[PDB]
Design a protein around this ligand. Structure first.
Ligand SMILES: NC(=O)C1=CN([C@@H]2O[C@H](COP(=O)(O)OP(=O)(O)OC[C@H]3O[C@@H](n4cnc5c(N)ncnc54)[C@H](OP(=O)(O)O)[C@@H]3O)[C@@H](O)[C@H]2O)C=CC1
Lengths: 499, 499, 499, 499
């Protein structure tokens, strides 16, 4: 006997042992008589068009693939629920937080960032940790990472960042010169880069890492009063990492290590869970905060803004069909129920357009009609119609225009957005020079110990050594600007690696 | 008070007066607070991306259209049932014919041939009369026209034919020279052309014309014995046509005449119906038949092959949403339940491939998962997986490969095809000169009376006069080959039209 | 001899009389030996899969159609040039206006608004008059109508307006209750409806109507100084309209009248031209303007803001293939060269998003690589890569990320946008009650004469009589609000029509 | 200094040192003023829709991906030429062989079979070796593997085979039970499985393996005489393999080993080349051949059917843009110029449909218009029009129907297919028990030496040990049937691996 993942077909057969096998049909539901031999003229003659059994099967085989995600393509999924344990109704009126005890169905995707569909699980990379809450006020997608921060703080740099992380447009190879020419030209990366190359760069599967919303978000209570917040979901299973040595062995021994670990845990009843907390910053703490509180390269320090618990995320169910339920999952940061709103974070503002946009391409115009994407715990009603692959009565014969004197759906005034006042020139403000070093210095000196600093520098040098000298020089200077000993250690190791 | 079609919204409201109107949401199920005013900075300021309510609705609006059908684009739809009235089980074992009294849900689409989505209903053109039977053995699509015959007898001439009937590739205008250059170069068109320019070329709506499967099909009984057949469905409302003068007034007065007629009839309880008959030819009779029994430009004469009755088609339901239920309808002549099979008709052999092919483009790869297209009275199970817009459980965790020791679906040996023997060179055989005139001569002399022949020639001359003289000459010569008086009457009229 | 349009094929043959006809190939370039007969086993045998000549052609036929435009689907195209005739360089630094005499290639499309591909030309609807300028600074799309104004002033009402103008979602019929329910609920429509139902609602083809950008736009000169402007392009051929009576005859006699008129004109050297003028409003004048200067339902009166001439638009070339050059034409109001900017017009702010969005659906992700869409008078260079149907080098091996130390494309600082100051609450402002009546009153009383007022009301009553009584009442009231006699004349005529 | 692949961007900049960098534009050719900072109201304000620079770039980023290939997704490409060295015009009349010395440009793509886009190069799998010849008679696609044979001999088992080789539909994990259940239920796989688990299962890059067409094809000379043939292209660089130990190290050290090796070889002038040979079998030898000569699990032994040389394949140019030139490469076994025809091989018959079909889904309806797919050395002329993303003049105003009196393209009678006679029942013939063991016995005993047999069984057992015991037993039995000592060595090793 072997691990439960491998006994999948064995189990599927056992769970069916009582009934007869189904009649094998065409997609049109016509039974087939023989599907191992083609309709031909004579045993050694040519194939016939009449063989629509072959055509029907081949055409669908021919159309099996859809575009992979443009980032976060390698993915593992599971299902479960969110349960409220504490009362934060004074900050948010969202139905998902309505009383202690309330459960909401969730769906989760875990991913790496750079790799395509066939890439190894145990590599140095950030991890996507996206959570879809199926609430009565519609779906809530908290599309977060394994980090509170990101490498950049304006969405116009995003496609670039990603290009620089992926393959060279001519050679189709990972290119250290791209990676570090970008990172060194944009020192705002200093904070997230430092996180990346320390121990948590390679987590031991998905169950031993935290999730963050990373963005500042806005919560709105029943009175119309607003606060800003951060979401943190901390692992109940404890932070646990892989060493470079073990991560590399597994990269060839089990490219699908995280995917297997997740499935096996759930199947053996060992159900993983997280504790959701928030931090809260009032509008008048946001004016006097020393950095830009919407800067995605900055955290809110725990000393000044402590964690306030909200509840548990629990994963207790595996997908039944991986393609249907985890490859077709779409998360839109813009799916926000009343009580939860966007901050003016430049990066989050971008993600409000990007995701529904890419989903309309990757999946299709009507991708919200795909069961796992459906807001099945809410009644969708509006004046949208048609599109390719329309799957429900399309709304019926309801009046399709608004306003109307025929009692089609009505707007709900309580669901209006919080109103903020803004003033300034409409222009492109340069954010390149928001303090890129301070929080990093703290991280280096105060969070990391002696050994961890040493490994941090070894990890960095071990990858930066493959970039050209002029690029190394500039990266080193950026690291020096955080701490002279940071730069020095890295430079001592580069001197050796250069022969 | 007006016709029922005009009162559609009125009625929708009345049927609802007892409830409160639904909450208006985004596609993600989020309630909207205001949907008449955009989120802007100040009353005369610019739009924000934060307005996801605007984007969500606009992005769907933008994706509303799908490619119209490449032919038969203008269509009217309805739903009802087929009921068996007579016993033809000695010819076919198909479940849809199993006992007298058996009802099968049907869907029907009526169409013109050449015009695009906005064209007028009451024009000279053949009419499509596609019929989908939802049987327990899977769907059966009888994709027929208002005529027993077509213009050509090889599928390689079809794209041409259609091109010649549609718009000039440069000017985007209907082009008489294309129409008649083709027809004159291909006299096999003489039969259908004579049908088209008779009174029956403009039916008074969809309720007053016949349906034909036109092709020869094959029927297989329980013993494994086969005969060849034609399907005729005759209107129970009686043949009725529009005159040229009335058809033209309606063309601007009500471009949607046949659509409104069909809807109002069903809504006022006058449900239209057809009687399904067959003609049967034994394999032996096929060998001694004077023409090619699979030549789509030929009928089987009634004297030698009388109509045997089978059933009634009844339309008693209107569609609730026209896009969902009529624009997305897909018929495949290749959806044939055991007991019905194709003949070797060159034209039908082409249709076996073309329709599923075009559907994968027009609707999409999984178009069969769209409710109206679903074989919902059959259990679909096989080794096909994935594809864009996957809508069910994607057949779950079932083993996806065949054969397997894990009890996935099995082939059903009784559903094998009838075995026929063929012998000859694999080669492209010329069918341009199969008899092109005989059956037409009969039609001209023995089916039409004196007045009808006169109108036939007037309708032909009225359209042919716009073609160049060399094209007119050649067409007239083809008409002379049927009968000298046919030719000379047309020529006398062209002499006048040419001034 | 006939009109030039109908001699198209004749002329194509004459222009080729010297050369031999090309060898007919598969799409893959393989010469075909016979394309009139299918590869079968024996003359009355079944079709083989190894007929790849058949398949290759049918598969393309099957994929001929693409989605029609979601609005303005019925269209006519031509090509030509714009020529600067007057100096407005003090207002705009745009390369297209650089010197008197300067010519720029243009592409125009003319459309109706509501009809689908097959619909008649001579119907009451607004007309599209889209101009694409191929400038050295990239493409400039002036996507305009044959009216200075529009029915609504917020883009969130757009999809609804269009739904109401189109087909009932159940009956698939034009529905007067939808049309007038909307218009009567949204009186802002009063101005444009008044235009629509007067003589100019049916132009005598495309050569006898004006064009307008409708929107307020922003112009920016070499100094960085901005002004607001309107674009009017008046016909040099003179305004000319069809009467209801002749428009209806032509709707069946020649569904393609505007198409044919334009093609024949250009083919016979009678080249239509328009004169481009602007109106200019300074930023100061914009603060004191009595209405909202960016309200799409308002004009700037000629007394206070006279027309200032700029140049000529001339159409002197017909398309060669209609599909490639006129069905695939894409216009984006967002294509604006430096010198021309958007105003804060709520309506135009929406069009900035909508068009590129729909274009990616209707044609494809890389639609801008389609010859007629290409900015071929400029050099496209950036960090965009890949996508479906990539057609040039894909920009080679050039570094694909920005910034870089490898000399890929650089930003041009002089191309930066004009900076404006805005202040106010970020919220949804109600525009429902901006002055809906004043400019219409002026239209009714001061622009129209006696006869025209009469015809205006007859035209309104002829269509409004098909709506329910409660809808009539409410519409009439909106017209009374413009002028008591306006409401009255309409009501007297409805009184008659209601028997 | 490092390898040439790593210096790609370095070299790109050098090759450009003399010019100024290009102006950065929108896709519409509009220069951009700043592309690092988003348009916002105030430095800490929300993003605007007016930022069309952001949307234009993000929208394209969002549509970057297309469906990977359904099999052979991981790939490497190069370009060069084919040169004729010997005279085989007595067998084939194709222009590509027309005289000694004749050069034809080619495109090659090397690939693995099961892995997706991100999988490792140095793994046990067959290798695709597809060659596209750009002939005057249109494209010739020789779509071959690094082996003469395949695992199955009917096309209806293909989707299954592939499913069995890829991921479990629930766990998304590679599944040994699927792999060997299939292989053990279908012993026709014995031949190719033995090849695969032997030394040549993991080639040292693409330059050190052979290519085969595998299928029997047909050749036709000027006299209309025909013979059957096999294409073998043998590496000029010599067969060279990796050991299991090294292949596994490289799988994590350089997942893109083969890609890097090819690019580096070409860049340093060391240009790889292959020698094209055929085997020839007369129609009459085909009738007496001891096996089915069209059975894809069978080879033609060299003693009886020696290699005849034809020419050289040389790869001397790297792609400039990987996506444009290698990801969008499409090969159709159905692209065959006159002089080359298909045999009746059941498998090949299915490939005639599959490839164009999948290309229409993967790339698009008009994928043959993509530069690298174009038959750019032929003149494509026919009656095919339109489709999504139509890129040329769409063949202008040419008459679009056939036949015509207007001198559009004509069929070329010399390019008719060879005519063969076939006779038999049209039915599904069972090919499951054609000899499954004879040629495999020969391979085991006569081709492998003692050491190699040892490694073969070690390789087989190392993978087969993960499958269930009943599956093991069955596979071993299939191996015993080839030779008792084959099955018995594998069983001795499985006994140990099962503890
Ligand atoms: N305040 C925050 O939200 C976080 C801050 N940081 C870093 O700590 C600095 C000071 O934060 P402050 O709140 O004042 O200090 P604290 O000491 O209160 O917080 C330390 C935090 O760092 C996280 N952490 C520990 N090791 C690593 C690592 N190797 N990689 C990434 N994260 C790690 C811990 O997460 P855990 O709870 O799992 O132990 C803990 O939340 C910041 O400048 C920032 O660099 C990092 C994460 C969160």
């Amino acid at each position: 006997n072997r691990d439960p993942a491998s006994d999948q077909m064995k189990h599927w057969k056992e769970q069916r042992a009582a009934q007869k096998p189904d009649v094998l049909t065409t997609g049109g539901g016509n039974p087939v008589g023989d599907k191992l031999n083609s309709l031909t003229v004579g045993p050694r003659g040519p194939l016939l068009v009449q063989d629509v059994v072959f055509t029907d099967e081949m055409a669908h085989f021919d159309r099996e693939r859809i575009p992979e995600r443009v980032v976060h393509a390698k993915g593992a999924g599971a299902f479960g629920y969110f349960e409220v344990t504490h009362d934060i109704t004074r900050y948010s009126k969202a139905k998902v937080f309505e009383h202690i005890g309330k459960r909401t169905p969730i769906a989760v995707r875990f991913s790496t960032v750079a790799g395509e569909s066939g890439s190894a699980d145990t590599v140095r990379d950030p991890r996507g940790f996206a959570v879809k809450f199926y609430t009565e006020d519609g779906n809530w997608d908290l599309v977060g990472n394994n980090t509170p921060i990101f490498f950049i703080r304006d969405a116009l740099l995003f496609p670039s960042f990603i290009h620089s992380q992926k393959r060279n447009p001519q050679t189709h190879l990972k290119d250290p010169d791209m990676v570090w020419d970008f990172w060194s030209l944009r020192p705002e990366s200093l904070h997230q880069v430092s996180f990346l190359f320390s121990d948590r760069g390679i987590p031991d599967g998905h169950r031993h890492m935290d999730g963050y919303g990373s963005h500042t978000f806005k919560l709105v209570n029943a009175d119309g009063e607003a606060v800003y917040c951060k979401f943190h979901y901390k692992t109940d299973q404890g932070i646990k990492n892989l060493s470079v040595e073990d991560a590399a062995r597994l990269a060839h021994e089990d490219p699908d290590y995280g995917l297997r670990d997740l499935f096996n845990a759930i199947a053996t009843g060992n159900y993983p869970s997280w504790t959701l907390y928030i931090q809260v910053m009032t509008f008048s703490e946001a004016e006097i905060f020393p950095f830009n509180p919407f800067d995605l390269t900055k955290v809110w320090p725990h000393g000044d803004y402590p964690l306030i618990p909200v509840g548990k995320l629990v994963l207790n169910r595996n997908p039944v069909n991986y393609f249907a339920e985890v490859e077709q999952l779409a998360f839109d940061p813009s799916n926000m129920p009343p009580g939860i709103e966007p901050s003016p974070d430049k990066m989050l503002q971008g993600r409000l357009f990007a995701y529904p946009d890419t989903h309309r391409h990757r999946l299709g115009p009507n991708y919200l009609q795909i069961p796992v994407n459906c807001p099945y715990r809410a009644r969708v009603a509006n004046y949208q119609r048609d599109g390719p692959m329309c799957m429900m009565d399309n709304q019926g014969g309801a009046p399709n225009y608004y306003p109307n004197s025929f009692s089609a759906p009505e707007h709900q005034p309580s669901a209006l957005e919080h109103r903020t006042h803004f003033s300034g020139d409409v222009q492109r403000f340069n954010s390149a020079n928001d303090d890129n070093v301070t929080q990093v210095r703290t991280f280096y000196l105060k969070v990391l110990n002696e050994e961890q600093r040493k490994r941090l520098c070894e990890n960095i040098a071990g990858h930066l050594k493959d970039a050209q000298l002029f690029i190394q020089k500039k990266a080193v200077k950026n690291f020096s600007d955080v701490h002279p000993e940071y730069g020095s250690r890295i430079q001592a190791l580069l001197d050796k690696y250069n022969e």
